[PDB]
Amino acid sequence: TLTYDDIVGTGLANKCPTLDDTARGAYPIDSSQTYRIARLCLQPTTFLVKEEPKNKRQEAEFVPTKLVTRETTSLDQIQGELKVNSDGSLTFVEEDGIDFQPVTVQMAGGERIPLLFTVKN
């Protein structure tokens, strides 16, 4: 278990927690108890931008991009209700957290694409 000073400057602060290869279990849901997501973390590893072609009869593809705003991209400390629905499905309702990050990526040739990477609401 690491402390801030073990972490600071390493880039680890922009990475979500992981689980081992042995974590292939199952978490029981008790339909009478209420549940919440105490922490949701989302760590982007690829940004792709759909090309905007002239012909408009070719299917446009998503192409790779270069991140230029450094290790500032992850969503974390997100929390909310985890409902158990009548049909046994679960619904997560986001309520709060660091749930947006501005991001600028660059396409081949230099065009910069800013976006608000988010899962708000």
Partner: protein, 51 residues
């Protein structure tokens, strides 16, 4: 004196300054190539090799 269309004949008997002049000419040609490529890169649109 030498008329204007003969000024470069001073190099005929001067191998070293002939090499200098050839070096300067080579410098200008290579410089044109570099500048020409930069100008084309500053104006080329790479987004559509089809049309």
């Amino acid at each position: 004196g030498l008329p204007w269309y003969r000024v470069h004949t001073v190099l005929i008997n001067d191998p070293g300054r002939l090499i200098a002049a050839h070096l300067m000419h080579t410098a200008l040609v290579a410089g044109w190539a570099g500048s020409m490529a930069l100008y084309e890169l500053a104006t080329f649109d790479p987004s559509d090799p089809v049309l």
